Design a binder for this molecule. Structure first.
Ligand SMILES: CC(C)CCC[C@@H](C)[C@H]1CC[C@H]2[C@@H]3CC=C4C[C@@H](OC(=O)CCC(=O)O)CC[C@]4(C)[C@H]3CC[C@]12C
Ligand SMILES: CC(C)CCC[C@@H](C)[C@H]1CC[C@H]2[C@@H]3CC=C4C[C@@H](O)CC[C@]4(C)[C@H]3CC[C@]12C
Ligand SMILES: O=C(O)C1=CCCN(CCON=C(c2ccccc2)c2ccccc2)C1
Ligand SMILES: [Cl-]
Ligand code: NA
Ligand code: NA
Lengths: 536, 214, 219
C-alpha cells in the first residue's frame, strides 16, 4: 500500500495547526479565564493540558503516522473487536458537519454586510428594530441591544419562528452563503492533500494576521488595559473549585479535538519516521498560545466597552456566537476606521472555521477511502457526494428557524458522542493493545520509547480525565431550552438518537464482528484481540 | 550501507598531548545518532559518547565530541595513559547499523633497541622430520622491525612466521618473534644459522647468530 | 547491576548451524531493544541484527540476512541468535548489546562468545623447549623460550612455573599458517636463577584435552 504524502512538511503542520485552532480559542477560552479566576485559571488549565489534553493529542498523531490508514481501517487493524470505534467516529464527524458549518456561513454573511460607510448593526431605527432596542447590552432579557436585534431579526429572522416545528420560510439570501463555504472546501479537498496542504497556508495563517492587527488596534484603545485586568487578574481560590478544574478539563479536550480521526488521517499521510513527538508538542503549544493571544485581542476591546461605552462587564463578557456576532461587532461600529476592523474580524472567524472543518471531513475521506477501494477510486466525485448531503440537510439551518435547528444539534449530535467514543479509544489502545506494544511502535518510528510519564498518563489519567469531563457534562443537563422557548419532549429524544446512533456501533460491530468470526468464546476473544501487525 | 572510515588508524601520542580523531561518513548522519565507543584491549566496547557530544556515565570530562553531516571527530583535550584504547564511531540513523574503521591510541616512548636471542631446534623436534630455529626480539620501540634469516651467509627468505605483541602496558614497549622452519633434511645439510634484526635505532643490523657445531 | 552474558559458541563447520544466547540480568529486559554485533579477528565491529523490546520489530545485516534469526524470551530474560548456512566470514566474537533508544547508542555490552566457523581439523600442539646455544654466561640475566607448534583451534594457555613467573615473560599471539596455529613465549630470568630452579613452561590445549609441562634443560 503506497499512499500520497505531504508535498512539504509544514503543509502537515499547518493543516494540524489549522484544525486545532478554531473558534473555541477566541470565543470560549477568554470567557473561561474571566469567569474562573483570570491568570489563576491557567494552573488547572495547564495541569489538565499536561495530563489530559496533550497525551490524547500525541496518541492520535502517533496512531495516524504509524498505521498509515484512516479511522475505519486503523481501529480495525488495532483491535478488531472495536472496529466500530472507526464507524462511530466517522459518524460523529458526519453529524458535526450538519451543523458546525453554518457558523462559518454566519461570519460570511456579516463579511458581505460590512461593505458600507455605516455598518447596519449600530443604530436602533431600522425596519427590523423594536421599542425594546437599547444601544448596548443590559441586565434584562426582554430589552436587547442593537446588535442583538440585527442578528435575531435581520440575519436569522429567528423571531419569525415558533420553535423547531416551525422552520417556516427558507432564507434565500443566506442559503447562498452556506453554498460559498462548501465550494472553498471542494476546490481544496477534491485533489487530496496535494491542494489541501497548500490552501491551509492562507486559512491557518490569516488568523494570525488578523489577530496581530486586532491586537495592536484593541490595545491602543481607551480602556484597553482595563480589559486585560478582567482577563488575567488572579483569584487562586478558583483552583479549589471543581468547576474550574472541570471547565479546564473540558475546554482542553474539546479545543485540542483528538479522536475524530482527523489527526489520525492527517498523520496517516506522514512519513513513517517523522518525529511525531516534536509535531505533537509544537502544534499543541501553538494551539494554547493562540488562545492566550486571542484573549488579549478579545478582552482589550471588552475593556474599551466598559470604559468608553458604559456597560457592565457581566453583560458583555460572554462566550459563543453571542460574543462574536453581537457584542464584539458592537465595539467595531464605534471605533474609528470601523468597517476595516470588521472585515478582517469576520474573515478571521471564517478562516478559523475552515481549517477545522477540513479536518473533520478529511477524517471521513481518508477513513472511507482506505477501507473501500471503490470510493478511493473516485475521490473527486465522492467528495462531491457528501458535500451535497451536507448542503441539502444544511438548508434546514438556513430557514427562519434555523437557529433552533443549529442549537438542537449543538447539544446532542456530537458533544456526548465523542466523549465516550474516545473513552473507548483510550482504553482500547492502552489496555487491549497495551502500552507495551505502543511504546514499541513509536520507538520504531522516532527512535526512542515515550517516557514512563506518557504511559501512566495514557493508562490512568486519560480515562479518569475523560470520565471527569463526561460526569461534569452530564450533571449540567437540563432538558433542552433556549430563551423562553422550551423544546418539545420528542426533540430531546431525537437528539439522543443522533447522539446514540454514532456510538451505538461500538458494541454493534463488536457483537456483529464477534459471532461473524469462528471458534469458541475465549478462543475467539483473542482473534479480535490479536492486532493486524501481530498477525503477520 | 553508510560506510564510516576513521583516521588515523593508529594514533601514537603522549600522556599530555591533545589529540583528535575524525570519522567520515559516506552518507550524511544525524547528530542525534552518531556515537563513540572506547574498547580497551581484552574487553568489550563501552559507550563513550552518544549523540555526537554527550558523555556517558563515568567518562572523564577531558573527552569531547563534535561534527555534523558527513564529518565528526572525537577529541581528547589532554591524553592520559589510561586512554590507550581503540575508538569506534557508530551511526544509529539507518539500517544497516554501521561502525567505524577504528582509531587505536598507542603511547609514545623513548626509542629502544631489541635485545635479540637465537635458539636452535630442540633435540625433540628433529626426532620428527622438522626443525625450527627461533629468533626473539624483545623490548623495543617503535613497533616496526625487519628480520633477515641467512643460511650460510646466503639469505633464506621462505618459511617464516613473524608475530608481534601489543604495546606492553608497563614500559610501552613491543616484542616480536620470528620462526624459520625447514625440513630436518634441509636443515641438517647446512652449517651456520644467522638472524639479523635491522631497526631504526642502529645504522648496523644487530647480528645474533649460531652454528650447528659446538 | 545490569549484566549481559553470552554463551553457545565454539568450533563449527561451514554450512553448520549453532545458536547463541544472551542472559540479561539487573534490569527489565522486556522493555529494551537488543542487538547482536560481532567483531572479526581484524577487530572490525559489524552489527548483525536488532530485536525490539517485544520482538515485534526486526532488522538484519544484509550480509547476514536469510541465515540468522534473532529472538527473545522476556519471561526467562534471554536473547537468542540462531544461525544456519554458516560461512567462514561469520567467525567473530558475538557481542549482545542493550540499545533501546537509538539517539543514545548501545548502553551496555556483554562479554562476548567467540565462534570460529572453519573446516580445519582439531590438532594437538607440539610443545618444544628453547634453551640457549652454548654462549658465555652473558649478563646477570638470561632468556629462555617455549615454542607451541601446529595446533587448532584456539586458545592455548601458556604459563611459567604454574603461574609463579610473571616478571619478564613475553607470550606472542598465535598466527594461523596453512590451517595450523603456532605460538611462542620467552621468559627472561636473572642468570642467578638458571639453571638452578626448574624453568618450566606448562601448556594446555582444551579442545584436544592436552596439558603438557616442559622443563627447559640446558643444552
Ligand atoms: C499559557 C498557555 C500557552 C499554557 C501553556 C501550557 C503548556 C505550553 C505547557 C505547561 C506545562 C507543560 C507540560 C509540563 C510537563 C511536561 C512533562 C514532559 O515529560 C517528559 O519529559 C517526557 C519526555 C520523554 O520521556 O520522552 C513532557 C512535556 C510536558 C507535558 C509539558 C508540555 C507543555 C506544557 C503543557
Ligand atoms: C500576536 C500574533 C501575531 C502571534 C504570532 C503568530 C505567528 C506570527 C506565528 C505563531 C505560529 C507560527 C507558525 C508555527 C509553525 C510554523 C511551522 C514551521 O515549520 C514554519 C513556520 C510556522 C508557519 C510558524 C510561522 C509564525 C507563526 C504563524
Ligand atoms: O476550537 C475549535 O473550533 C475546535 C477545535 C478542534 C476542531 N473542532 C471542529 C470539529 O469539532 N470537533 C470536535 C472534537 C472534540 C473533541 C475530540 C474530537 C473532536 C467537537 C465535538 C463535539 C462538539 C464540538 C466539537 C472545533
Ligand atoms: Cl484553548
Ligand atoms: Na482549539
Ligand atoms: Na481552523
Amino acid at each position: 500500500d503506497e499512499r500520497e504524502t505531504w508535498s512539504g512538511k509544514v503543509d502537515f503542520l499547518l493543516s494540524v495547526i489549522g484544525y486545532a485552532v478554531g473558534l473555541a480559542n477566541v470565543w470560549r477560552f477568554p470567557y473561561l479565564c474571566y469567569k474562573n479566576g483570570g491568570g489563576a485559571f491557567l494552573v488547572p488549565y495547564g495541569i489538565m493540558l499536561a495530563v489530559g489534553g496533550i497525551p490524547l493529542f500525541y496518541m492520535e498523531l502517533a496512531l495516524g503516522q504509524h498505521n498509515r490508514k484512516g479511522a475505519i481501517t486503523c481501529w480495525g487493524r488495532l483491535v478488531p473487536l472495536f472496529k466500530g470505534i472507526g464507524y462511530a467516529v466517522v459518524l460523529i464527524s458526519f453529524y458535526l458537519n450538519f451543523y458546525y458549518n453554518v457558523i462559518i456561513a454566519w461570519s460570511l454573511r456579516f463579511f458581505f454586510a460590512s461593505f458600507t460607510n455605516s455598518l447596519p448593526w449600530t443604530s436602533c431605527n431600522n425596519i427590523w428594530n423594536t421599542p425594546n432596542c437599547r444601544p448596548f447590552e443590559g441586565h434584562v432579557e426582554g430589552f436587547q441591544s442593537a446588535a442583538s436585534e440585527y442578528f435575531n431579526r435581520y440575519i436569522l429572522e429567528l423571531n419569525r419562528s415558533e420553535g423547531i416545528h416551525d422552520l417556516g420560510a427558507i432564507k434565500w439570501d443566506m442559503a447562498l452563503c452556506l453554498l460559498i463555504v462548501y465550494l472553498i472546501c471542494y476546490f481544496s479537498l477534491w485533489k487530496g492533500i496535494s491542494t489541501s496542504g497548500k490552501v491551509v497556508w492562507f486559512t491557518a495563517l490569516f488568523p494570525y494576521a488578523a489577530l496581530l492587527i486586532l491586537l495592536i488596534r484593541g490595545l491602543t484603545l481607551p480602556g484597553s488595559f482595563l480589559g486585560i485586568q478582567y482577563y488575567l487578574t488572579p483569584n487562586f481560590s478558583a483552583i479549589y473549585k471543581a468547576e474550574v478544574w472541570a471547565d479546564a478539563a473540558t475546554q482542553v479536550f474539546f479545543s485540542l479535538g483528538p479522536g475524530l480521526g482527523s489527526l489520525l488521517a492527517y498523520a496517516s499521510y506522514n512519513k513513517y519516521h517523522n518525529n511525531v513527538y516534536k509535531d505533537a508538542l509544537l502544534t499543541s503549544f501553538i494551539n494554547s498560545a493562540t488562545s492566550f493571544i486571542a484573549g488579549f485581542v478579545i478582552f482589550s476591546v471588552l475593556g474599551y466597552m466598559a470604559h468608553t461605552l458604559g456597560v457592565r462587564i457581566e453583560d458583555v463578557a460572554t462566550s459563543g456566537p453571542g460574543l462574536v456576532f453581537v457584542v464584539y461587532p458592537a465595539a467595531i461600529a464605534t471605533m474609528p476606521a470601523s468597517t476595516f476592523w470588521a472585515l478582517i474580524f469576520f474573515m478571521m472567524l471564517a478562516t478559523l472555521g475552515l481549517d477545522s472543518q477540513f479536518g473533520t471531513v478529511e477524517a471521513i475521506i481518508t477513513a472511507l477511502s482506505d477501507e473501500f477501494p471503490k470510493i478511493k477510486r473516485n475521490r473527486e466525485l465522492f467528495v462531491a457526494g457528501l458535500f451535497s448531503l451536507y448542503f441539502v440537510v444544511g438548508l434546514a439551518s438556513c430557514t427562519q428557524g434555523g437557529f433552533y435547528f443549529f442549537h438542537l444539534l449543538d447539544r446532542y449530535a456530537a458533544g456526548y458522542s465523542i466523549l465516550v467514543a474516545v473513552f473507548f479509544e483510550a482504553i482500547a489502545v492502552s489496555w487491549i493493545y497495551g502500552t507495551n506494544r505502543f511504546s514499541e511502535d513509536i520507538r520504531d518510528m522516532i527512535g526512542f520509547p515515550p517516557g514512563r510519564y506518557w504511559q501512566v498518563c495514557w493508562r490512568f489519567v486519560a480515562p479518569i480525565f475523560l470520565l471527569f469531563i463526561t460526569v461534569y457534562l452530564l450533571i449540567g443537563y437540563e432538558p433542552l431550552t433556549y430563551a423562553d422557548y422550551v423544546y418539545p419532549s420528542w426533540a430531546n429524544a431525537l437528539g439522543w438518537c443522533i447522539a446514540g446512533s454514532s456510538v451505538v456501533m461500538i458494541p454493534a460491530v463488536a457483537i456483529f464482528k464477534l459471532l461473524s468470526t469462528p471458534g469458541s468464546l475465549r478462543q475467539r476473544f483473542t482473534i479480535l484481540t490479536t492486532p493486524w501487525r501481530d498477525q503477520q | 550501507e553508510n560506510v564510516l572510515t576513521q583516521s588515523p588508524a593508529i594514533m601514537s601520542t603522549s600522556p599530555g598531548e591533545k589529540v583528535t580523531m575524525t570519522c567520515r561518513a559516506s552518507s550524511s548522519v544525524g547528530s542525534s545518532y552518531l556515537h563513540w565507543y572506547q574498547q580497551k584491549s581484552g574487553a568489550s566496547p563501552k559507550l563513550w559518547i552518544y549523540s555526537t557530544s554527550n558523555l556517558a556515565s563515568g567518562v572523564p570530562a577531558r573527552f569531547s565530541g563534535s561534527g555534523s553531516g558527513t564529518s565528526y571527530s572525537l577529541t581528547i583535550s589532554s591524553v592520559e595513559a589510561e586512554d590507550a584504547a581503540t575508538y569506534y564511531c557508530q551511526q544509529f540513523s539507518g539500517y544497516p547499523l554501521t561502525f567505524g574503521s577504528g582509531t587505536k591510541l598507542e603511547m609514545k616512548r623513548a626509542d629502544a633497541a631489541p635485545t635479540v636471542s637465537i635458539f636452535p631446534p630442540s633435540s625433540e623436534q628433529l626426532t620428527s622430520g622438522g626443525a625450527s630455529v627461533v629468533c626473539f626480539l624483545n623490548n623495543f620501540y617503535p613497533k616496526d622491525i625487519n628480520v633477515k634469516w641467512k643460511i650460510d651467509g646466503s639469505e633464506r627468505q621462505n618459511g617464516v612466521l613473524n608475530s608481534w605483541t601489543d604495546q606492553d602496558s608497563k614500559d610501552s614497549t613491543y616484542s616480536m618473534s620470528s620462526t624459520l622452519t625447514l625440513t630436518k633434511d634441509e636443515y641438517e645439510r647446512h652449517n651456520s644459522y644467522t638472524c639479523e634484526a635491522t631497526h631504526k635505532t642502529s645504522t648496523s643490523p644487530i647480528v645474533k647468530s649460531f652454528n650447528r657445531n659446538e | 547491576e545490569v549484566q549481559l552474558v553470552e554463551s553457545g559458541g565454539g568450533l563449527v563447520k561451514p554450512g553448520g548451524s549453532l545458536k547463541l544466547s544472551c542472559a540479561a540480568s539487573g534490569f527489565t529486559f522486556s522493555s529494551y531493544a537488543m542487538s547482536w554485533v560481532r567483531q572479526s579477528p581484524e577487530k572490525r565491529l559489524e552489527w548483525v541484527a536488532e530485536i525490539s523490546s517485544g520482538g515485534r520489530y526486526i532488522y538484519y545485516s544484509d550480509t547476514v540476512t536469510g541465515r540468522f534469526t534473532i529472538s527473545r524470551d522476556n519471561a526467562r530474560n534471554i536473547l537468542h541468535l540462531e544461525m544456519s548456512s554458516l560461512r567462514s566470514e561469520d567467525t567473530a566474537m558475538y557481542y549482545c548489546a542493550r540499545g533501546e533508544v537509538r539517539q543514545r547508542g548501545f548502553d551496555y555490552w556483554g562479554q562476548g562468545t567467540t565462534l570460529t566457523v572453519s573446516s580445519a581439523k582439531t590438532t594437538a600442539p607440539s610443545v618444544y623447549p628453547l634453551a640457549p646455544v652454548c654462549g658465555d654466561t652473558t649478563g646477570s640475566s638470561v632468556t629462555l623460550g617455549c615454542l607451541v607448534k601446529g595446533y587448532f583451534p584456539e586458545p592455548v594457555t601458556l604459563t611459567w612455573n604454574s603461574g609463579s613467573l610473571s616478571s619478564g615473560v613475553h607470550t606472542f599471539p598465535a598466527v594461523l599458517q596453512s590451517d595450523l596455529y603456532t605460538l611462542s613465549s620467552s621468559v627472561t630470568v636473572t642468570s642467578s636463577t638458571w639453571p638452578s630452579q626448574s624453568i618450566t613452561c606448562n601448556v594446555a590445549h582444551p579442545a584436544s584435552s592436552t596439558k603438557v609441562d616442559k622443563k627447559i634443560e640446558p643444552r
